[PDB]
Amino acid sequence: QLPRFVRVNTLKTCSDDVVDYFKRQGFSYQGRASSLDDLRALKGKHFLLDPLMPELLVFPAQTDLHEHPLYRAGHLILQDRASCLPAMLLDPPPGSHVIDACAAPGNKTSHLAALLKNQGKIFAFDLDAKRLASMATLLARAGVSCCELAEEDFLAVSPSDPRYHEVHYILLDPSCSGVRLHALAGFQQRALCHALTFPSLQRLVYSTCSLCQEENEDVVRDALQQNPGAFRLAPALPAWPHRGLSTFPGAEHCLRASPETTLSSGFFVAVIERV
């Protein structure tokens, strides 16, 4: 199956320290991968850094770290390779205000917090109590202190609420396919259009783990047609070769992902910026 991807949580440690710990357990550090073939070749107790994703270590498919001392300590966060894209691309600076619109169980929220260096605010929302409970555990384990978490419908969050007036960055990572399809795409469109109405918004990242154009390029296309000229697609990570389907002008600025092409979950990401 796929290699195991583990994000070094910079809130609590650094890559040098994690590497040294694993070395002392008899793992052999291979540096940074030159290519995906390097990751595909991973075996035994070799490990390396992802060829593109900062702070992302990669281990052979048959290694479990859920019980590792560094997992307990919140030094490692087990996060699919493509799941690391949205916060990295959003790139909010320390001190900024961010909304994580569909946040639980908090993997991307924890990544945002690391990028913020726990400075600023992440207003996170979700409706699922069980996933919210998992999120509380993850956030605390990872040492996140900048998140205000609410059990709320994102569509009920008012863009004119004074609490969100300095929000410049939004991460929108809504539920997606699995043939529940038209309803899912409906929520995705509603949520994206809603997010784009936030008064001070500068950059938004939209992501799914779907392969379906209806949930991906079509949603972005339709949202951009809401207020033509207000927002544009930004040209995301050129070194990532799997792009959005060429279904509208600029769509190739989005990213796609799959086990076979990118050693990750099926995934889609669009970087949307204010004009």
Ligand X SMILES: C[S@@+](CC[C@H](N)C(=O)[O-])C[C@H]1O[C@@H](n2cnc3c(N)ncnc32)[C@H](O)[C@@H]1O
- Residues flagged as binding site for S-adenosyl-L-methionine: 102-108, 126, 131, 173
8-16, 167-175, 192-200, 217-225 -> range binding ligand X (CB under 6 A): 167-175
What is the 3-state composition of the chain as percent helix, strand, coil, each rounded to the nearest 5?
A: 35, 25, 45
- Which residues inside 93-122 make contact with ligand X, applying CB under 6 A? 102-108
- As a whole number of angstroms, the distance between CA 53 and CA 41 comes to 18
Annotated active-site residue in 84, 176, 209, 254: 209
How far apart are CB 41 and ligand X at their closest, in Å? 29
- Of 65, 78, 127, 193, the one binding ligand X (CB under 6 A) is 127
Separation between Cα atoms, residue 173 and residue 221, nearest integer Å: 16
* Token pair recorded at residue 21: 């710990």
State the number of binding residues for ligand X (CB under 6 A). Answer: 18
Eight-class DSSP state of 11: T
Burial class (CB in 10 A: 0-12, 13-18, 19+), 108: buried
| 3 state DSSP class of 93 | coil
Q: Are the CB atoms for 156 and 86 separated by under 8 Å?
A: no
Q: Does residue 267 touch ligand X according to CB under 6 A? A: no
Residue 56: phi and psi, rounded to 5, are -110, 110
Q: How far is the CB of 137 from ligand X (least distance, A)?
A: 12
List binders of ligand X among 216-255 (CB under 6 A): none
Cα 94 to Cα 97: distance, rounded to the nearest angstrom: 9
Residues 6+ apart with CB under 8 A from 75: 8, 9, 12, 13, 17, 18
Q: Is 88 in the site for ligand X (CB under 6 A)?
A: no
- Which window, 32-40, 48-56, 173-181, 261-269, contacts ligand X (CB under 6 A)? 173-181
- 170: nearest Cα among 137, 190, 199, 136: 199
Return the residue of 173, 215, 217, 218 that touches ligand X, per CB under 6 A: 173
Residues in region 128-147 near ligand X by CB under 6 A: 128, 131
Whole-angstrom Cα distance, residue 40 to residue 122?
35
Contact status: 126 vs ligand X (CB under 6 A): yes
Q: Give the nearest distance from C-beta 134 to ligand X in angstroms.
A: 9
Select 84 or 251, whichever has its Cβ closest to ligand X. Answer: 84
Distance, CA of 121 to chain centre: 17
Q: Point out which span in 60-68, 168-176, 194-202, 228-236 binds ligand X (CB under 6 A).
A: 168-176
Residue 266 binding ligand X, by CB under 6 A: no
Residue 206 touching ligand X (CB under 6 A):
no
Round to whole Å and give the CA distance between 219 and 210: 12
Query: Is residue 212 annotated as a catalytic residue, yes or no?
Result: no
User: Exactly one of 42, 50, 55, 175 binds ligand X (CB under 6 A); which one?
Assistant: 175
User: Catalytic site residues?
Assistant: 209
Residues lying near ligand X in the complex (CB under 6 A) are found at 102-108, 125-128, 131, 153-155, 173-175
